[PDB]
Scaffold this motif. Structure first.
Motif, PDB file in Angstrom:
ATOM      1  N   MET A   1       0.818  -1.216   0.000  1.00 40.88           N
ATOM      2  CA  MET A   1       0.000   0.000   0.000  1.00 40.88           C
ATOM      3  C   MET A   1       0.857   1.273   0.000  1.00 40.88           C
ATOM      4  SD  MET A   1      -1.445  -0.203   3.974  1.00 40.88           S
ATOM      5  CE  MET A   1      -2.183   1.449   4.025  1.00 40.88           C
TER       6      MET A   1
ATOM      7  N   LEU B   1       1.302   5.237   1.126  1.00 42.85           N
ATOM      8  CA  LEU B   1       0.891   6.056   2.269  1.00 42.85           C
ATOM      9  C   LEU B   1       0.341   7.429   1.862  1.00 42.85           C
ATOM     10  CD1 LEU B   1       3.738   5.128   4.732  1.00 42.85           C
ATOM     11  CD2 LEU B   1       1.663   3.875   4.259  1.00 42.85           C
ATOM     12  N   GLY B   2       0.523   7.821   0.604  1.00 45.62           N
ATOM     13  CA  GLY B   2       0.083   9.086   0.022  1.00 45.62           C
ATOM     14  C   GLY B   2       1.077   9.575  -1.025  1.00 45.62           C
TER      15      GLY B   2
ATOM     16  N   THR C   1     -11.379  28.359  -0.567  1.00 48.51           N
ATOM     17  CA  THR C   1     -12.620  27.638  -0.850  1.00 48.51           C
ATOM     18  C   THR C   1     -13.382  27.413   0.450  1.00 48.51           C
ATOM     19  OG1 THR C   1     -11.461  25.507  -0.919  1.00 48.51           O
ATOM     20  CG2 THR C   1     -11.852  26.538  -3.003  1.00 48.51           C
ATOM     21  N   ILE C   2     -14.707  27.341   0.362  1.00 49.41           N
ATOM     22  CA  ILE C   2     -15.562  26.933   1.476  1.00 49.41           C
ATOM     23  C   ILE C   2     -15.851  25.453   1.293  1.00 49.41           C
ATOM     24  CG2 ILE C   2     -17.763  27.315   2.680  1.00 49.41           C
ATOM     25  CD1 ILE C   2     -15.722  29.698   2.895  1.00 49.41           C
ATOM     26  N   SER C   3     -15.444  24.646   2.261  1.00 47.29           N
ATOM     27  CA  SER C   3     -15.537  23.196   2.202  1.00 47.29           C
ATOM     28  C   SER C   3     -16.564  22.740   3.213  1.00 47.29           C
ATOM     29  CB  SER C   3     -14.166  22.589   2.486  1.00 47.29           C
ATOM     30  OG  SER C   3     -14.209  21.179   2.397  1.00 47.29           O
ATOM     31  N   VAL C   4     -17.621  22.076   2.752  1.00 51.63           N
ATOM     32  CA  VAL C   4     -18.610  21.433   3.617  1.00 51.63           C
ATOM     33  C   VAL C   4     -18.374  19.939   3.557  1.00 51.63           C
ATOM     34  CG1 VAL C   4     -21.011  21.169   4.286  1.00 51.63           C
ATOM     35  CG2 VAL C   4     -20.285  23.294   3.256  1.00 51.63           C
ATOM     36  N   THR C   5     -18.142  19.333   4.711  1.00 52.38           N
ATOM     37  CA  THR C   5     -17.820  17.912   4.858  1.00 52.38           C
ATOM     38  C   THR C   5     -18.736  17.288   5.883  1.00 52.38           C
ATOM     39  OG1 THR C   5     -16.124  18.403   6.503  1.00 52.38           O
ATOM     40  CG2 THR C   5     -15.340  18.124   4.290  1.00 52.38           C
ATOM     41  N   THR C   6     -19.202  16.078   5.622  1.00 53.30           N
ATOM     42  CA  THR C   6     -20.156  15.375   6.480  1.00 53.30           C
ATOM     43  C   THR C   6     -19.447  14.423   7.436  1.00 53.30           C
ATOM     44  OG1 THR C   6     -22.175  14.099   6.429  1.00 53.30           O
ATOM     45  CG2 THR C   6     -20.708  13.561   4.704  1.00 53.30           C
ATOM     46  N   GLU C   7     -19.797  14.456   8.719  1.00 51.96           N
ATOM     47  CA  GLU C   7     -19.329  13.519   9.739  1.00 51.96           C
ATOM     48  C   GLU C   7     -20.485  12.762  10.386  1.00 51.96           C
ATOM     49  OE1 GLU C   7     -16.948  15.140  13.001  1.00 51.96           O
ATOM     50  OE2 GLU C   7     -16.505  13.124  13.643  1.00 51.96           O
ATOM     51  N   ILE C   8     -20.443  11.431  10.367  1.00 50.51           N
ATOM     52  CA  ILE C   8     -21.502  10.567  10.880  1.00 50.51           C
ATOM     53  C   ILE C   8     -21.066   9.927  12.198  1.00 50.51           C
ATOM     54  CG2 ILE C   8     -22.945   8.570  10.346  1.00 50.51           C
ATOM     55  CD1 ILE C   8     -21.390  10.228   7.382  1.00 50.51           C
ATOM     56  N   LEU C   9     -21.876  10.063  13.249  1.00 49.85           N
ATOM     57  CA  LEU C   9     -21.643   9.478  14.574  1.00 49.85           C
ATOM     58  C   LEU C   9     -22.837   8.637  15.039  1.00 49.85           C
ATOM     59  CD1 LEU C   9     -19.926  12.579  16.093  1.00 49.85           C
ATOM     60  CD2 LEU C   9     -18.983  10.339  16.311  1.00 49.85           C
ATOM     61  N   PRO C  10     -22.637   7.384  15.489  1.00 47.02           N
ATOM     62  CA  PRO C  10     -23.606   6.671  16.313  1.00 47.02           C
ATOM     63  C   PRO C  10     -23.943   7.434  17.591  1.00 47.02           C
ATOM     64  CG  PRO C  10     -21.930   5.127  15.563  1.00 47.02           C
ATOM     65  CD  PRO C  10     -21.481   6.546  15.237  1.00 47.02           C
TER      66      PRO C  10
ATOM     67  N   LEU D   1     -23.446   3.726  10.907  1.00 49.45           N
ATOM     68  CA  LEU D   1     -24.780   3.537  11.492  1.00 49.45           C
ATOM     69  C   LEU D   1     -25.394   2.201  11.086  1.00 49.45           C
ATOM     70  CD1 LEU D   1     -26.216   7.144  11.094  1.00 49.45           C
ATOM     71  CD2 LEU D   1     -25.144   6.149  13.080  1.00 49.45           C
TER      72      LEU D   1
ATOM     73  N   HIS E   1     -30.546   6.083  14.541  1.00 54.54           N
ATOM     74  CA  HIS E   1     -29.626   5.820  15.660  1.00 54.54           C
ATOM     75  C   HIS E   1     -28.354   6.688  15.710  1.00 54.54           C
ATOM     76  CE1 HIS E   1     -32.318   2.642  17.047  1.00 54.54           C
ATOM     77  NE2 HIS E   1     -31.873   1.712  16.191  1.00 54.54           N
TER      78      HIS E   1
ATOM     79  N   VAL F   1     -26.313  10.887  14.525  1.00 52.64           N
ATOM     80  CA  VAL F   1     -26.282  12.289  14.105  1.00 52.64           C
ATOM     81  C   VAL F   1     -25.266  12.455  12.987  1.00 52.64           C
ATOM     82  CG1 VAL F   1     -24.631  13.110  15.884  1.00 52.64           C
ATOM     83  CG2 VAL F   1     -26.294  14.689  14.949  1.00 52.64           C
TER      84      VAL F   1
ATOM     85  N   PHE G   1     -23.094  15.626  11.172  1.00 50.92           N
ATOM     86  CA  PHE G   1     -22.687  17.023  11.217  1.00 50.92           C
ATOM     87  C   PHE G   1     -22.181  17.434   9.853  1.00 50.92           C
ATOM     88  CE2 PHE G   1     -22.251  15.664  15.665  1.00 50.92           C
ATOM     89  CZ  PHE G   1     -22.951  16.697  16.296  1.00 50.92           C
TER      90      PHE G   1
ATOM     91  N   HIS H   1     -19.987  19.992   8.582  1.00 53.58           N
ATOM     92  CA  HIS H   1     -18.989  20.951   9.045  1.00 53.58           C
ATOM     93  C   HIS H   1     -18.562  21.863   7.913  1.00 53.58           C
ATOM     94  CE1 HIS H   1     -18.407  18.517  12.713  1.00 53.58           C
ATOM     95  NE2 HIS H   1     -17.914  17.512  11.988  1.00 53.58           N
TER      96      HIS H   1
ATOM     97  N   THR I   1     -15.999  24.741   6.677  1.00 58.35           N
ATOM     98  CA  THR I   1     -14.621  25.115   6.978  1.00 58.35           C
ATOM     99  C   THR I   1     -14.057  26.002   5.881  1.00 58.35           C
ATOM    100  OG1 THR I   1     -13.540  23.135   6.056  1.00 58.35           O
ATOM    101  CG2 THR I   1     -14.270  22.905   8.256  1.00 58.35           C
TER     102      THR I   1
END
Ligand SMILES: *[C@@H]1O[C@H](CO)[C@@H](O[C@@H]2O[C@H](CO)[C@@H](O[C@H]3O[C@H](CO)[C@@H](O)[C@H](O)[C@@H]3O)[C@H](O)[C@H]2NC(C)=O)[C@H](O)[C@H]1NC(C)=O
Ligand SMILES: *[C@@H]1O[C@H](CO)[C@@H](O[C@@H]2O[C@H](CO)[C@@H](O[C@H]3O[C@H](CO)[C@@H](O)[C@H](O)[C@@H]3O)[C@H](O)[C@H]2NC(C)=O)[C@H](O)[C@H]1NC(C)=O
Ligand SMILES: *[C@@H]1O[C@H](CO)[C@@H](O[C@@H]2O[C@H](CO)[C@@H](O[C@H]3O[C@H](CO)[C@@H](O)[C@H](O)[C@@H]3O)[C@H](O)[C@H]2NC(C)=O)[C@H](O)[C@H]1NC(C)=O
Ligand SMILES: *[C@@H]1O[C@H](CO[C@@H]2O[C@@H](C)[C@@H](O)[C@@H](O)[C@@H]2O)[C@@H](O[C@@H]2O[C@H](CO)[C@@H](O)[C@H](O)[C@H]2NC(C)=O)[C@H](O)[C@H]1NC(C)=O
Ligand SMILES: *[C@@H]1O[C@H](CO)[C@@H](O[C@@H]2O[C@H](CO)[C@@H](O)[C@H](O)[C@H]2NC(C)=O)[C@H](O)[C@H]1NC(C)=O
Ligand SMILES: *[C@@H]1O[C@H](CO)[C@@H](O[C@@H]2O[C@H](CO)[C@@H](O)[C@H](O)[C@H]2NC(C)=O)[C@H](O)[C@H]1NC(C)=O
Ligand SMILES: *[C@@H]1O[C@H](CO)[C@@H](O[C@@H]2O[C@H](CO)[C@@H](O)[C@H](O)[C@H]2NC(C)=O)[C@H](O)[C@H]1NC(C)=O
Ligand SMILES: *[C@@H]1O[C@H](CO)[C@@H](O)[C@H](O)[C@H]1NC(C)=O
Ligand SMILES: *[C@@H]1O[C@H](CO)[C@@H](O)[C@H](O)[C@H]1NC(C)=O
Ligand SMILES: *[C@@H]1O[C@H](CO)[C@@H](O)[C@H](O)[C@H]1NC(C)=O
Ligand SMILES: *[C@@H]1O[C@H](CO)[C@@H](O)[C@H](O)[C@H]1NC(C)=O
Lengths: 40, 317, 240, 46
Positions: free
Chosen positions: A9, A11-12, A31-40, C26, C136, C138, C140, C142, C144
């Motif tokens: 692999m 590494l970048g 730039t304006i960056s909108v990014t989604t974060e998913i949490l249980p 999820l 179950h 959320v 977000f 974000h 930036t």
């Protein structure tokens, strides 16, 4: 013409930063960056 | 940051070289598959934990071939080329200060996805990004700045005026170089400094040692050896003695998998903390008090260690 | 800035409307919950060494005393099947609580605030976050600021003028290669190096890498035009 | 007056003290009032 391959692999992308005792890089734009974060 | 990955052949641990015991173990159903799903769920997250801590860098940043850092000498913490793995001088202290018959009981240890060379390359890119570009590589592309001009921004971050760096820069560089000198001397001389990482290796080893020792236990059967039970007794009495060993062994496995699941949650909490110290102390400068060491945080340098991370936190006192 | 925000929210709809797997964190919780109950129902089919897995096949076939030796096998194995499920669920509930305590902290610090913590509220410099609910969980969004189009400049820690050393108040000194400017650190917008952009400390001898350039004092030409205003008033007054 | 900001009067702050506050524009104009005066005293001669 398809197969399973096996590889070491990466590494970048590799990058030498242009450091010098008297050089600075300053961003001339943004730039304006909108990014989604998913949490249980 | 991680602990050893293990998996077990539940049928070889309980019933190794026994068709009779294997045909009785079928009476218990899903448990041997459910134990292997538990140890796999642990093993898959040891790679997650390691990758969440170290792989926070987009590109493998390299230092310039000329080390004009304004007098700050990073040579004890940067890569040393004259090695098979490009670890730093301080990383090769850390890898020596932690010191690391089970197999034929069906137990085995799985390799991590990232080798110690790949953890060292990520750590090199985090360090070479930090000293060439400050926090800017955490929030965009790496933008170069002179290191004493970065340290002046860091002095403003602690509420100290930037001429207090430039007018004292040789003292500040000598105090940093003398403080990194004392890190080497402490780590070289003192045994107990990596006690946190040796304790994880010692807990993994004591758990596998206890798991193998439970094979010698009778559990109230006439022997701990399946061949003694099968040679001395008939089918219907041997099946009563073999079931005691199946019951006690299967509880010896369920106890190991439970203490491993409970211990994996402690290692995950520590990996999540180490990933937060990587983001907030290495890729930034932190106003959070005592989070990045005692004093007012200037910056931090990551170093890899056996199954862990070391942060060298730099502070104004 | 508004068109870039509206385009970035557009790409959240396009990604979520396209890929099957974005909520994998999820769906893993639902899959673990369902797998543990399906495994627990499968452990009813096991004999544990009894003549059958079914109590009605033991209680129809055996007498009251020969049944109990079979029934206790099924009780022993099932009771261990529940203690396994409940131990797995108590361990798994602590994984979900640690995630709920993090999500509650991102709600407080990313939605109800603006975070200075690096990479806590997305990859960039945090502006603000918007919460969205999911099964179950959320989500977000974000928002930036990401700096995008850099230029190289020559730079200096200080400017030397009347033998005094000048430092930026906020910003950094830069040069295009021939002129010196002061600019804000995070966006190239250059100004002339005035006494309102800079502060003095000490003399030019102590700072490593200081450069010579003029430092403008905006009071001076407003007094110097007062010196031309005075001089023409004297030239006029010579006439009588 | 460059290091400091003003608000209100001496009667409200518990433990306020007396010291002079230098105005860097004052000598910058008083050395210009001597530039006025020496040009006037010269112009007494014709
Ligand atoms: C470094 O930055 C300097 C400022 O932007 C720049 O100098 C400026 O160059 C422009 C022409 O490109 C001049 O513009 C004026 O030109 C004549 C002057 O008589 C007028 O008719 C025009 O209306 C206009 O005002 C500026 O006068 C000049 N400014 C200064 C302070 O000299 C340099 O060229 C830049 N150098 C590099 C390498 O980028
Ligand atoms: C930045 O500006 C400084 C002030 O103009 C300048 O310092 C001056 O440099 C000149 C040339 O090196 C010196 O010239 C004299 O040097 C010695 C005496 O010091 C004599 O033997 C020589 O004959 C000559 O007359 C000035 O004395 C010196 N002045 C001060 C106050 O140091 C810097 O050199 C400038 N730096 C750059 C890189 O432009
Ligand atoms: C800080 O400086 C203030 C200005 O000099 C000073 O205020 C002055 O205080 C004195 C004593 O209280 C007053 O003196 C007069 O007191 C009464 C009238 O109030 C008369 O009967 C006396 O004969 C005498 O003239 C000043 O009038 C008063 N000046 C003003 C403008 O209020 C403060 O007292 C100083 N504070 C400290 C702690 O030193
Ligand atoms: C910033 O400059 C670096 C390198 O220094 C420059 O070298 C000249 C080309 C000239 O620009 C001088 O004024 C500078 O001293 C640039 O890095 C190079 O990038 C090219 C690709 O564009 C690559 O082929 C080289 O290998 C790089 N060299 C080094 C030493 O890094 C960099 O691209 C410049 N960045 C910006 C944003 O302008
Ligand atoms: C800063 O970047 C933005 C895009 O991120 C640039 O805006 C684009 O400009 C081009 C023409 O140069 C147009 O074709 C695009 O439609 C624009 N996009 C948007 C979203 O408006 C902007 O020009 C850049 N500004 C500077 C000073 O470089
Ligand atoms: C940075 O610090 C290291 C010491 O930690 C310096 O390396 C030593 O330099 C002396 C003088 O050349 C040698 O005799 C030693 O053998 C070096 N030790 C090692 C571990 O390499 C290094 O010279 C310093 N860098 C600078 C630019 O001064
Ligand atoms: C500030 O403290 C530093 C040490 O932390 C002082 O530096 C030392 O000064 C003595 C002589 O005064 C030397 O013997 C040491 O070698 C210096 N140490 C270093 C690391 O350079 C410094 O003098 C103090 N400055 C003030 C103004 O008190
Ligand atoms: C920067 O390094 C160059 C050599 O590349 C040297 O000539 C110069 O004097 C240095 N300047 C500073 C500010 O250290
Ligand atoms: C001289 O100055 C006076 C004002 O003091 C003005 O009224 C007059 O027009 C001026 N005349 C000339 C010739 O400058
Ligand atoms: C401070 O305390 C002293 C008594 O030690 C008292 O006389 C004085 O008035 C107090 N000053 C303030 C500013 O509270
Ligand atoms: C006085 O003013 C004249 C011009 O009117 C000028 O030539 C002379 O040098 C001045 N003298 C002094 C002492 O300022």
């Amino acid at each position: 013409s398809q197969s399973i391959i096996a590889y070491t692999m990466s590494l970048g992308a590799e990058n030498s930063v242009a450091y010098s005792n008297n050089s600075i890089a300053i961003p001339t734009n943004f730039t304006i960056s909108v990014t989604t974060e998913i949490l249980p | 940051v991680s602990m050893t990955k293990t998996s077990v052949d539940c049928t070889m641990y309980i019933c190794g070289d026994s068709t009779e015991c294997s045909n009785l173990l079928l009476q218990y159903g899903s448990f041997c598959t459910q134990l292997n799903r538990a140890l796999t769920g642990i093993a898959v997250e040891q790679d997650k934990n390691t990758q969440e801590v170290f792989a926070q860098v987009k590109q493998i940043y390299k230092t310039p071939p000329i080390k004009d850092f304004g007098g700050f000498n990073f040579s004890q913490i940067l890569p040393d080329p004259s090695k098979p793995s490009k670890r730093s001088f301080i990383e090769d202290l850390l890898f020596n200060k932690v010191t690391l018959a089970q197999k034929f009981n069906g137990l085995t240890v799985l390799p991590p996805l990232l080798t110690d060379e790949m953890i060292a390359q990520y750590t090199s890119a985090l360090l070479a990004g930090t000293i060439t570009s400050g926090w800017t590589f955490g929030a965009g592309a790496a933008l170069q700045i002179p290191f004493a001009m970065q340290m002046a921004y860091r002095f403003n971050g602690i509420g100290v005026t930037q001429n207090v760096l430039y007018e004292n820069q040789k003292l500040i560089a000598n105090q940093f170089n003398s403080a990194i000198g004392k890190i080497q001397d402490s780590l070289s001389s003192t045994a107990s400094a990596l006690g946190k990482l040796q304790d994880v290796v010692n807990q993994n080893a004591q758990a596998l040692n206890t798991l193998v020792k439970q094979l010698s236990s009778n559990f109230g059967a006439i022997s701990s050896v399946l061949n003694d039970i099968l040679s001395r007794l008939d089918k219907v009495e041997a099946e009563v003695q073999i079931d005691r060993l199946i019951t006690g062994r299967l509880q010896s496995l369920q106890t190991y998998v439970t203490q491993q699941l409970i211990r994996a949650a402690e290692i995950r909490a520590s990996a999540n903390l180490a990933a937060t110290k990587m983001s907030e102390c290495v890729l930034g400068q932190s106003k959070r008090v005592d989070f990045c060491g005692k004093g007012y945080h200037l910056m931090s340098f990551p170093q890899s260690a056996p199954h862990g991370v070391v942060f060298l936190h730099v502070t104004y006192v | 800035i508004a068109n870039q925000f509206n385009s970035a929210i557009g790409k959240i709809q396009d990604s979520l409307s396209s890929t099957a797997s974005a909520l994998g964190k999820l769906q893993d919780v639902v899959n673990q919950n369902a797998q543990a109950l399906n495994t627990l129902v499968k452990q009813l089919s096991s004999n544990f060494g009894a003549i059958s897995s079914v109590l009605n096949d033991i209680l129809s076939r055996l007498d009251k005393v020969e049944a109990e030796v079979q029934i206790d096998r099924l009780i022993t194995g099932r009771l261990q099947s529940l203690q396994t499920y409940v131990t797995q669920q108590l361990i798994r509930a602590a994984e979900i609580r640690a995630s709920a305590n993090l999500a509650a902290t991102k709600m407080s610090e990313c939605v109800l605030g603006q975070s200075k913590r690096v990479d806590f509220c997305g990859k960039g410099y945090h502006l603000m976050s918007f919460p969205q609910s999911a099964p179950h969980g959320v989500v977000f969004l974000h928002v930036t600021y990401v700096p995008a189009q850099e230029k190289n400049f020559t730079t200096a820690p200080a400017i030397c003028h009347d033998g005094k050393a000048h430092f930026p108040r906020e910003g950094v000194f830069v040069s295009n290669g021939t002129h010196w400017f002061v600019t804000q650190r995070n966006f190239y917008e250059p100004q002339i190096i005035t006494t309102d952009n800079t502060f003095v400390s000490g003399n030019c001898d102590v700072v490593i890498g200081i450069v010579n350039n003029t430092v403008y004092d905006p009071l001076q030409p407003e007094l110097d035009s007062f010196k031309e205003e005075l001089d023409k008033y004297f030239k006029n007054h010579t006439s009588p």
